[PDB]
Symmetry: C3
Subunit: 345 residues, 3 copies
């Protein structure tokens, strides 16, 4: 009885995002997405540590789904018989039935079709939540992603002016809990079930061993740095399904930030660092003003540098010496300098 | 010389709240409350672990006090001689004398009467704070609650429209620090003083062993689930006197949320997850749109599922298939399906 | 080619702040500051524990720099040859080159001159960031401070009214990671390089051993309590370069708080406790209404009382019995009292 146009969306792997319109004059549609659960061993750091992961569509995070206010979202969730455990899905964007989790529990070899109406604008987490202690374990094993519900008029600045991005990236941050042996080395396991009891012990102490973007330390550095150009307005969606984060663009700012992630609320302007509460997604716009490398981090710098949570942007364009310049390059401290007379000596 | 009507309020045990008016045309009154300190052993999880607690009025959290802007609040704090330690009270809603703590220190066998004017609207923490290392120890042993100071016109949406709740609940979240023996089992003690040195060692590592609502894992699940009905606007006051929390209603949203908890500031709309800074109370309104079970959690899901921090709502009414529906129930993956051709394989 | 008046600013040690104008009709200037790196052993708690610190200008935090929107800030960073490591500086207030870090790396015996334009208003962190795992280590060793960029019209309340402070203090909060030996005692080292490997092990577990204001437990208590007077509007700038904090003035409120620290956004009013995200600075105004001692804490009370994070204000003036009064001093519980009949017994 729901008589609306259907449109199939093909998702893509983060940090990229499937094609979509920002503002639209299309009416509501049934937007059709498919997510396939994949349990698999994955590499999670630069020394090659492996991890028994559980994923939607084979990536951590799961892919970003993008729809508009008033759309209906029809998700086919597939759990292939190569998997070992039951899984489900819960959308923070949806209303009722534990976000859908109470309607989507599937054993290996099954699939299920859920439809939810996109009544709330913003970016939101989705994640597996099979029940009881399985809920944190499936989420911290990788089973989480995000959905963005745009207003039909696109974003605005909360003061009646339109905002448009030239580029969008989805940064999913994952806290991981990898057991260590007596000597302090990370342990390997042959299946998720085998990893569980030792992993739950690490989870109970609430301190991750790794905090990574796009599934692995170094995932978005080197060859896979994020590209941009001076002058582009870039939207950075950040999610964390289980633990707080404090995003910061080193060398930049958040020009417009919805740190609680919901477009019915005006964004804050000109932030240095913002805050993603565990269990949520947020979003920040920035217009690049300078070329060069930028690091995007969580600004617990121990997590950023030592546990895996740094991404890079490589920005092409012309340097602006008015905004910043090296007035004098490193040189020897002048013989005639008198720093021994300073107040703090 | 303060010549105002006096009115005695009888408090009730959380998560319920004493009767009160939201909007009022009554002028300022002296609102009279009594809190009695009770030290006692309490059960704090589903395996029966006991804990040497310290409470106001025998509950964790202490009861919610509700007054209106401009009222004076006259609290009699009683420390019976069955107790072993000095106690006091500090109201974050009050001005001066460390929130009252500097005027309320009482030994066992004593009582004291403090009056403070309710000049600041919002929900606020109160807690014991005897001095030095006793302050965290008394708070994490259970000695904290909240007070709500409503505007005399009731709540509003920050854009000139009145908000009214049909139902109010007070969720106090408590981080607990229970010592373990060599084998990892929780230790029992015969008095608070006996528990102190081992408890302080756990406190120093900043990682709770339990994170509970209404004093115990499972307190607000099963028979003691919170009731509501489709269509009701429910106010959920959440406090945490010592540690951050990130509340989330699974299956719902925060329609209007004052996460810093102060009604002079407009609420944010349509949140998935909000943030209670340690040392504060916040409040969220939600109008239920779907029947069924909802879980209310802190969205560190390890804390929610494994350390005790889940409550349930049981909501009666009719399901709305427009907002969400199971289009196809779990079924075998069709023989003819082609999932091996997906981008991520 | 930048033809503007130059003005040299002499910095002072926190928590005080160099002299400056709040509102100004002066046009943009080049504001000249000098920071000298000093590595040195410092005492960090009341039992005399020492720490191999690294500082700007010999203090933790580094000094507060205050400029106005549109100024250019020309910083000479000096690394004397008595130091052992390379250092640099990154300003969250600046645009480009990792906030300046990519233009300021200096070996011992060198200095460098960076100029950045103050295009963003607010309070912001600055810190050393030499590269890779050196970044967290230099920051948690003390190499961080803050800069305030005021609007040229001074502060306002976001609703078109001017705000002016009578007094400003800069509270820098530092999380420290001090190794312990087998017996649990803090270890001492003869140099930063010698401390590094054991310190990095403590850093990886993300739990500080000390959380201090102005560099040491007790720094701003006793003789060095902060002064104020009833009626004064006091601005309290709080920074944390690496870890979240939740500031609270015990006995007071935040009348106007910019917890994300950026003056383009209206402040929130009447807060009990606010939140400084790690990697940021925030600011709160309060007009003192009562004399006496106030404690300013992070409201994880374990950190405040047991790990060093308490400051005091000593406020002179006349008590206001209307706002708060002790109606009856501690007395014996009346023989005739009937507390055994209360609901919770
Ligand atoms: O009290 C009514 C009764 O109906 C149930 C039957 O399973 O289902 C309702 O809720 C479901 C979603 O949670 C809907 O899919 C279903 O169609 C609706 O009828 C029970 O949950 C409930 O006890
Ligand atoms: O400097 C004045 C002096 O007055 C004291 C005396 O104890 O008390 C004032 O503050 C109290 C609350 O903190 C009030 O109850 C009291 O009535 C008021 O006079 C001292 O604290 C202070 O040194
Ligand atoms: O692609 C251009 C090229 O220019 C470089 C040369 O080192 O420098 C630019 O960026 C610097 C700041 O990061 C400025 O100081 C410099 O003046 C500007 O020309 C490279 O980083 C870059 O590869
Ligand atoms: Cu799963
Ligand atoms: Cu969730
Ligand atoms: Cu007490
Ligand atoms: Cu307090
Ligand atoms: Cu350095
Ligand atoms: Cu930084």
């Amino acid at each position: 009885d729901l008589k609306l146009p259907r449109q199939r969306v093909d998702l893509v792997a983060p940090p990229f995002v499937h094609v979509h319109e920002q503002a639209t004059k299309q009416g509501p549609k049934i937007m059709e997405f498919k997510l396939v659960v994949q349990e698999k061993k994955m590499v999670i750091d630069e020394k090659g540590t492996t991890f028994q992961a559980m994923t939607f569509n084979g990536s951590m995070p799961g892919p970003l789904m993008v729809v508009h206010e008033g759309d209906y979202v029809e998700v086919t969730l597939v759990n292939p018989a190569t998997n070992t455990m039951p899984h489900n899905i819960d959308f923070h964007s949806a209303t009722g039935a534990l976000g859908g989790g109470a309607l989507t529990l599937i054993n290996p070899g099954e699939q299920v079709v859920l439809r939810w109406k996109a009544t709330r604008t913003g970016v939101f987490v989705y994640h597996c939540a099979p029940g009881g202690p399985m809920i944190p374990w499936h989420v911290v094993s990788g089973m989480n992603g995000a959905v963005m519900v745009l207003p039909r008029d696109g974003l605005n600045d909360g003061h009646g002016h339109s905002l448009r991005y030239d580029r969008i990236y989805y940064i999913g941050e994952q806290d991981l809990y990898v057991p260590r042996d007596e000597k302090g080395n990370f342990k390997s396991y042959d299946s998720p079930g085998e990893a569980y009891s030792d992993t739950e012990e690490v989870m109970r102490k609430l301190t991750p061993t790794h905090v990574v973007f796009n599934g692995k330390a170094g995932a978005l550095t080197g060859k896979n740095a994020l590209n941009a150009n001076v002058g582009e307005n870039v939207l950075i969606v950040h999610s964390q399904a289980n633990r707080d984060s404090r995003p910061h663009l080193i060398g930049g700012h958040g020009d417009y930030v919805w740190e609680t992630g919901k477009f019915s609320n005006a964004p804050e302007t000109g932030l240095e660092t913002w805050f993603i509460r565990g269990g949520s997604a947020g979003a920040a716009l920035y217009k690049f003003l300078q070329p060069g490398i930028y690091a995007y981090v969580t600004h617990n710098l121990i997590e950023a540098a030592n546990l895996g949570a740094t991404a890079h942007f490589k920005v092409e364009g012309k340097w602006n010496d008015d905004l910043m310049t090296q007035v004098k390059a490193p040189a020897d401290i002048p013989t005639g300098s008198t720093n021994e007379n300073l107040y703090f000596q």
